[PDB]
Amino acid sequence: EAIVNAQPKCNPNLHYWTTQDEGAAIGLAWIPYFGPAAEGIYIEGLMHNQDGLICGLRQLANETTQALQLFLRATPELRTFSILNRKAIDFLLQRWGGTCHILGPDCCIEPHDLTKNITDKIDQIIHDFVDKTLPD
Amino acid sequence: EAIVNAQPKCNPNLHYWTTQDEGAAIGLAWIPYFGPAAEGIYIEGLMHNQDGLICGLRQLANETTQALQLFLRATPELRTFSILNRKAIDFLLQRWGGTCHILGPDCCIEPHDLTKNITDKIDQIIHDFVDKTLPD
Amino acid sequence: EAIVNAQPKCNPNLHYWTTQDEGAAIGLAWIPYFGPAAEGIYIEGLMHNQDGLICGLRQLANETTQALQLFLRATPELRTFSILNRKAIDFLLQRWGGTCHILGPDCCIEPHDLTKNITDKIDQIIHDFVDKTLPD
Amino acid sequence: IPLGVIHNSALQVSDVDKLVCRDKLSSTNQLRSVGLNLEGNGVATDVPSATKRWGFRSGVPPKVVNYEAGEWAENCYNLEIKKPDGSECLPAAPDGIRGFPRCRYVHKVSGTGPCAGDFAFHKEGAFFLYDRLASTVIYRGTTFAEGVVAFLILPQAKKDFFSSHSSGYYSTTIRYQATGFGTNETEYLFEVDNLTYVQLESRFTPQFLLQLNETIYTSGKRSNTTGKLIWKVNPEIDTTEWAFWETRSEELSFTVXXXXXX
Amino acid sequence: IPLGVIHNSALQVSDVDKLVCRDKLSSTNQLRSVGLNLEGNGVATDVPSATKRWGFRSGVPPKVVNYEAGEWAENCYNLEIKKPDGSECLPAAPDGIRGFPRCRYVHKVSGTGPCAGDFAFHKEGAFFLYDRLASTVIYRGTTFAEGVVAFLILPQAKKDFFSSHSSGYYSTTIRYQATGFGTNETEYLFEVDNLTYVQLESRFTPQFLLQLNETIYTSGKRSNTTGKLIWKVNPEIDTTEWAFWETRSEELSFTVXXXXXX
Amino acid sequence: IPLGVIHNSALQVSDVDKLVCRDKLSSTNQLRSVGLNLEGNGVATDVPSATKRWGFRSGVPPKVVNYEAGEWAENCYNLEIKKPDGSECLPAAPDGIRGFPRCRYVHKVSGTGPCAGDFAFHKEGAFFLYDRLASTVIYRGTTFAEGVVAFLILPQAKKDFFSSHSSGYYSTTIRYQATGFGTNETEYLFEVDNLTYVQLESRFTPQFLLQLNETIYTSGKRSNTTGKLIWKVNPEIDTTEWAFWETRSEELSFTVXXXXXX
Ligand SMILES: *[C@@H]1O[C@H](CO)[C@@H](O[C@@H]2O[C@H](CO)[C@@H](O[C@@H]3O[C@H](CO[C@H]4O[C@H](CO)[C@@H](O)[C@H](O[C@H]5O[C@H](CO)[C@@H](O)[C@H](O)[C@@H]5O)[C@@H]4O)[C@@H](O)[C@H](O[C@H]4O[C@H](CO)[C@@H](O)[C@H](O)[C@@H]4O)[C@@H]3O)[C@H](O)[C@H]2NC(C)=O)[C@H](O)[C@H]1NC(C)=O
Ligand SMILES: *[C@@H]1O[C@H](CO)[C@@H](O[C@@H]2O[C@H](CO)[C@@H](O[C@@H]3O[C@H](CO[C@H]4O[C@H](CO)[C@@H](O)[C@H](O[C@H]5O[C@H](CO)[C@@H](O)[C@H](O)[C@@H]5O)[C@@H]4O)[C@@H](O)[C@H](O[C@H]4O[C@H](CO)[C@@H](O)[C@H](O)[C@@H]4O)[C@@H]3O)[C@H](O)[C@H]2NC(C)=O)[C@H](O)[C@H]1NC(C)=O
Ligand SMILES: *[C@@H]1O[C@H](CO)[C@@H](O[C@@H]2O[C@H](CO)[C@@H](O[C@@H]3O[C@H](CO[C@H]4O[C@H](CO)[C@@H](O)[C@H](O[C@H]5O[C@H](CO)[C@@H](O)[C@H](O)[C@@H]5O)[C@@H]4O)[C@@H](O)[C@H](O[C@H]4O[C@H](CO)[C@@H](O)[C@H](O)[C@@H]4O)[C@@H]3O)[C@H](O)[C@H]2NC(C)=O)[C@H](O)[C@H]1NC(C)=O
Ligand SMILES: *[C@@H]1O[C@H](CO)[C@@H](O[C@@H]2O[C@H](CO)[C@@H](O)[C@H](O)[C@H]2NC(C)=O)[C@H](O)[C@H]1NC(C)=O
Ligand SMILES: *[C@@H]1O[C@H](CO)[C@@H](O[C@@H]2O[C@H](CO)[C@@H](O)[C@H](O)[C@H]2NC(C)=O)[C@H](O)[C@H]1NC(C)=O
Ligand SMILES: *[C@@H]1O[C@H](CO)[C@@H](O[C@@H]2O[C@H](CO)[C@@H](O)[C@H](O)[C@H]2NC(C)=O)[C@H](O)[C@H]1NC(C)=O
Ligand SMILES: *[C@@H]1O[C@H](CO)[C@@H](O)[C@H](O)[C@H]1NC(C)=O
Ligand SMILES: *[C@@H]1O[C@H](CO)[C@@H](O)[C@H](O)[C@H]1NC(C)=O
Ligand SMILES: *[C@@H]1O[C@H](CO)[C@@H](O)[C@H](O)[C@H]1NC(C)=O
Ligand SMILES: *[C@@H]1O[C@H](CO)[C@@H](O)[C@H](O)[C@H]1NC(C)=O
Ligand SMILES: *[C@@H]1O[C@H](CO)[C@@H](O)[C@H](O)[C@H]1NC(C)=O
Ligand SMILES: *[C@@H]1O[C@H](CO)[C@@H](O)[C@H](O)[C@H]1NC(C)=O
DSSP: OBOOOOSSOOOOOEEEEEEOOOSOOSSSTTSTTTSOOGGGOEEEEEEOOGGGHHHHHHHHHHHHHHHHHHHHHHOOOSEEOTHHHHHHHHHHHHHHSSOEETTSTTOOEEOHHHHHHHHHHHTTTTSSSSTTSSOO | OBOOOOSSOOOOOEEEEEEOOOSOOSSSTTSTTTSOOGGGOEEEEEEOOGGGHHHHHHHHHHHHHHHHHHHHHHOOOSEEOTHHHHHHHHHHHHHHSSOEETTSTTOOEEOHHHHHHHHHHHTTTTSSSSTTSSOO | OBOOOOSSOOOOOEEEEEEOOOSOOSSSTTSTTTSOOGGGOEEEEEEOOGGGHHHHHHHHHHHHHHHHHHHHHHOOOSEEOTHHHHHHHHHHHHHHSSOEETTSTTOOEEOHHHHHHHHHHHTTTTSSSSTTSSOO | OOEEEEETTEEEEEOGGGOOTTSOOOSGGGEEEEEEEGGGGTOOOSHHHHHTTEEEESSOOOOEEEOSEEEOEEEEEEEEEEOTTSOBOSOOOOTTOOOOSOEEEEEEEEEEOOOOSSEEEETTSOEEEOSSEEESBOOTTOOBEEEEEEEEEOOTTSTTTTTOOOOOOOOEEEEEEEESTTSSSOEEEEESSSSEEEEOOTTOOHHHHHHHHHHHHHHTOSOOSSSOEEEOOOSOOOOOOOOTTTOOOOOOOOOOOOOOOO | OOEEEEETTEEEEEOGGGOOTTSOOOSGGGEEEEEEEGGGGTOOOSHHHHHTTEEEESSOOOOEEEOSEEEOEEEEEEEEEEOTTSOBOSOOOOTTOOOOSOEEEEEEEEEEOOOOSSEEEETTSOEEEOSSEEESBOOTTOOBEEEEEEEEEOOTTSTTTTTOOOOOOOOEEEEEEEESTTSSSOEEEEESSSSEEEEOOTTOOHHHHHHHHHHHHHHTOSOOSSSOEEEOOOSOOOOOOOOTTTOOOOOOOOOOOOOOOO | OOEEEEETTEEEEEOGGGOOTTSOOOSGGGEEEEEEEGGGGTOOOSHHHHHTTEEEESSOOOOEEEOSEEEOEEEEEEEEEEOTTSOBOSOOOOTTOOOOSOEEEEEEEEEEOOOOSSEEEETTSOEEEOSSEEESBOOTTOOBEEEEEEEEEOOTTSTTTTTOOOOOOOOEEEEEEEESTTSSSOEEEEESSSSEEEEOOTTOOHHHHHHHHHHHHHHTOSOOSSSOEEEOOOSOOOOOOOOTTTOOOOOOOOOOOOOOOO
16 A cells, blocks of 8 residues: 545645754753753754655545554553554564564564575685595 | 462452553544643543452562562652663563674574474475486 | 772762662552551662762762753753663663664674584585485 | 463463564554453442442542543443532642543432542552543542453454444433441431332342332332332342343332321 | 555555564654645635534543644634624633644634534544644634644654745734634624624635735725625626635726625 | 773773674673762762752753662752742652652751752762652752763673672761852851751761751750740861761850851
8 A cells, every 4th residue: 555645635744843852952951950941942844745645645644644543542551652562563463462473574683694694604615624534 | 480469459340440542532522722631631430350360460569579679779760750661672682782693591582483394495395306316 | 991089089988778669568568548658658778889880870860960950951841750761771772773784883683602503513414415426 | 561462362460571583563553451340350340339338538640541442331420429417528620621422321319428638549459440531549420330450462363453444322310319328327318209219128120119209100119209209119029130231010018207107 | 543654755654463673663753643734635714614613512622632734824724703692602721722833824713603502623533733732622812823734754764854944924814703603604893993783795805805805995885984884796707716825906996784795 | 981891800981993702791780880979989968069060051961870889978958949039949859750769867958049040060070869760950859869870781791780799777867958059158047946046068978967966956056935945066176177988075055147156
């Protein structure tokens, strides 16, 4: 399933606001007593429709909402933050939550560098450990 | 440790209620304005004692409660949801939270398909790369 | 980056309090109706500056606070518990959140026990599967 | 907190020190929190026997834990208790805390008690089950069930247990009064109407309380006065200890506030 | 809840049953919750068209969800509605719930309505966006935007999208009154001062409301009396359906509480 | 948020860009949040020096973070401050917020101040430590300690640090009054009884405040009148800057509300 925008319009430029968690503020900004007030904790940016992301996103958000709204009904948590962390767990679980059969369709293990460094161990012992008939 | 029911009785049929998080409701149900009210968000089912699960479960829940109650004392979170997600993390951590020594007692890596596809590489080079003495 | 204490003083003995989550209380303690009241749920210990941990810790906590305080501004969660679990996820993600190339700089896979048990398979077939020219 | 897993066709508590790779947790949807009602272990579900398992205590703060799926209950309770001097005894349901969603009979107790304590806990270490929240305490006027929570990992053969895959939900409030609530010396009366109370005993089952409601109503024994009629029943109806999932009255009464008989 | 991922230079919904190892989630910082305003899909942003998408309903409890980054908005709303008999219609903003941080025009509606319901929901299944919290309901006197939340995984080529790497933030409250709020039969007036209301129509854009404010003020049509002057505009100014990101008044008025014209 | 790890027999901040597989996190129990008191870095613990590090501010909302284990404290504070016109200056402790569990001396300050602000923050970027919760602000009448939180990963050699493996907990409230609280121009008096205040200076240690309590009591200098007696001490007792963990009065007084000396 790919995403096709079926909205009346798509505003293809996304002006956004968010919050910097940086760790590296001017020198005292970070102390809350001296800190910016609620209204100016924000950073801003502008992202264009390169690769069609903004139109994609608007439609995705639309699409999402039922699936979300239903999930929200189901929980008695008043304000739900866990969602993302919870996704990231399922992410690891879906790859690592069970024996990983090397070279299976569903294993993330890449043994290519290994097997090179085992074919290079045998080519060694065809030149000396096979050199049993030719002595001195 | 297995679980033995030491209750006065065990009602071996579990009628249950829960909530569907589905994602696929009739078409407008999912909108909360039109949605079922608090009393009818539920689904129901019935599970029998096949493999002794219901009697198992009742006793398990009993057994659990001390271990839980103690945990609840210890946290100053008023309503504790994290419990399950937290279990699932320890699950991954206990298998993946440290170098996985292939073929160790505590590694989930199955290299059987690999090693077949390395014994099949050598049987190849006993028929041609060893064919150095017989020419043309 | 290591940690150097630049405080006026460092009290190098840490008397501490915390809570036992044990699971194994005297026999009724664990029932909250009979339980210790809020003031006596605690355990205590004393840790010395062995390996310089206490002075380390005091400075670390100091150092931490900006990075933390900033993070706290950024979230609209009133009381933030997720922090630790969230760290533990990033921990797994940073090692397992992507194909693990065996023997790469960033793979936690130790194949040493494997490759021994493949060099011991070839030394077998130099003594019999190579024994094609000498019959009976 | 111990975790159920199914090994060798039987549920067991899984042990951390050596969990093993055959086990498979592919998603979070494999973990479930399940709330089992205390009835199902065959505790007495009657109002005076139930109440004996609860007490007031102070200096322990309340804690709430979420569970995902609950048992249909036969018996629930809904307490509104005042101290003698009009004061509220049970704290208001905090925001988000709803009565247990599936009860057959809701024992709605009104009355007064000494209430020597801030909060009301379960004496046996059990929980008050509300709507997908378990609490350590009773909230005022909010339907609950007694029970206990378990956590398990389903195998992905059975991942849809509880989650996915109905002759209908039927409920009935049963009013009561009581004095001396929470001591060893408590009096309960069962309400038929405003002024028509029936003196209450342990052995009386809900079904029979409903037929007694149907007999006083039907046969006209409801107090026509504007004084409190306090009926009583003869100790001449017998049952001889049968749990509710396992598997009718022809008497009359004589008159004597108005502490009669039957 | 479906998750965006970028494959083949295009965003798509990722499907669980066969996600694939080339995909790479190295940290939590790669996951984002993003709140897009409904304007950007080109719904009508005017006050009577906006209001038509909201209704009162009871027995559905409110739920709140956090998102990390929001769109700069053109249009937001701030409702203080009373029922006719002085009663509050919208519940107070719970602790931590702030108005949407970036609005160009805040449509501050005061008025009265029937309000047949406990809470006010979005009829189309959308959310009220506040400060990094989305809610299912409207809170009293708290600025919001209509919109929707998406979740995605950024590739670590683009992990810093939204997070890291400014001609300034300019705002303007627009007061209104209204009667019959939430029915099909509602009257809105736009406030210039205490007693100088203008009758309101759909087609009127904020810019033009501000120039109308600038015309009544400037040209002295503000009621000098101490009665309510209710202006009106001629249907003789035209626009012929142009969204706001895509890309001036010489009339006067005649007099007739004081339901005049222009 | 930086994370402690033990490498080469020394604690260091671990760096994300190249954490390495020898490191081993086997469970969540290996991560700890630890709350260290500011005393232990040797800030002045006296009431007027402590107070100088706090101020009122508005437009910053409060935030709370949980930690798992705290230092036994020598000095804590418990503020109940009113503005001059009887109004409450500090917000009530929210539900779940308890005073710091282990304090030797609780400096209970009552008084009045200008309080030019919604909430009271720590000026140096530190936290108010309560019971397993750190907050950015002071709550009314709730015991706290100043300090800071660190996070670490224990190696599983040491996983039981803090967690698992006692001559007893002894506490003493010390009452004070103060005027002009939170400015540079504030007056503190130390309470012995209702009307027997002692004028307060920086250099006075708790021990010596307790012996001064033991001297005025013992030797009968408690005001027998029903006016406020305001004692003072001679500047003739010396100490010459010794922290509290490192390692007794024969004078009398002359009389002069009743601003005496000693
Ligand atoms: C998990 O599952 C177990 C098993 O059901 C529960 O065990 C119960 O624990 C509580 C303690 O918290 C017990 O309450 C006490 O019971 C005794 C006597 O009880 C008698 O009557 C019972 C009702 O029919 C009956 O089941 C009992 O039968 C068994 O026990 C006796 C030994 O007592 C034995 O001889 C029998 O052969 C049976 O095996 C018994 O005849 C009662 O005296 C206690 O009261 C005193 O102590 C309390 C303090 O706890 C105090 O408040 C009182 O005022 C008084 O001083 C107490 O009420 C209960 O009997 C147990 N049930 C069983 C079957 O053992 C446990 O609660 C479950 N946990 C949870 C969290 O649900
Ligand atoms: C995700 O994105 C989709 C697409 O934009 C949103 O789809 C909208 O869904 C809501 C339902 O919740 C629709 O509201 C209803 O609309 C009909 C008629 O609408 C007319 O006017 C619109 C405004 O300009 C216009 O867009 C419509 O044009 C399309 O639809 C018609 C078919 O109706 C079609 O013939 C056209 O060619 C267009 O494709 C249309 O002309 C209205 O009659 C409904 O009212 C009745 O039903 C409701 C119950 O829902 C009831 O309360 C009323 O009183 C009345 O009985 C209803 O209001 C809206 O039209 C849809 N928009 C589009 C473009 O399809 C969806 O909401 C988004 N989801 C979220 C969560 O934001
Ligand atoms: C982490 O650990 C560090 C180190 O302890 C803490 O550093 C402290 O930061 C605060 C700023 O938030 C400082 O407060 C200011 O201090 C100056 C002068 O302080 C003097 O008196 C101190 C008390 O004994 C003393 O420690 C100082 O000694 C050092 O500093 C000077 C330079 O000032 C140097 O010359 C010395 O040789 C020492 O190295 C010093 O003599 C004071 O003037 C400031 O007040 C002004 O500014 C504030 C705004 O911040 C304003 O509100 C005032 O009204 C005024 O205008 C200010 O109070 C403190 O001195 C620092 N301590 C040290 C030892 O450096 C830091 O707080 C810790 N973080 C946390 C989160 O706990
Ligand atoms: C006791 O029984 C009577 C009837 O047998 C109940 O009163 C009936 O209540 C129902 C439901 O509201 C009505 O449809 C009937 O008209 C009533 N019948 C009579 C004969 O009054 C009464 O509600 C029952 N009380 C309790 C406590 O269960
Ligand atoms: C309507 O316009 C007038 C001015 O054109 C506004 O009143 C001005 O408000 C500003 C900002 O506070 C002042 O600096 C000016 O002195 C005012 N000018 C006059 C001519 O009164 C008024 O605030 C506007 N009203 C609305 C609803 O936007
Ligand atoms: C000041 O000291 C006196 C006693 O030295 C304290 O009053 C004593 O308080 C204790 C504990 O409640 C009692 O057992 C004694 O009987 C009291 N003795 C006398 C001589 O009154 C007083 O509480 C102390 N005050 C402060 C502020 O610490
Ligand atoms: C292959 O593995 C061996 C381990 O025995 C290692 O020392 C060697 O350097 C590897 N070869 C190459 C080319 O990296
Ligand atoms: C074994 O590995 C090689 C990789 O060089 C692969 O192409 C080949 O198909 C594998 N053999 C079988 C039988 O799958
Ligand atoms: C090596 O692997 C084989 C699997 O075919 C196993 O049975 C054998 O015991 C291993 N050798 C040793 C020495 O462990
Ligand atoms: C009791 O009487 C009141 C009016 O006095 C009436 O409204 C109510 O329904 C009656 N309750 C019962 C249970 O009969
Ligand atoms: C309305 O009048 C009041 C005083 O009667 C004044 O304070 C207020 O600013 C006026 N509001 C407007 C919008 O003109
Ligand atoms: C102050 O006097 C009141 C009664 O007037 C008394 O109850 C209280 O204990 C006294 N407080 C102190 C600290 O002496």
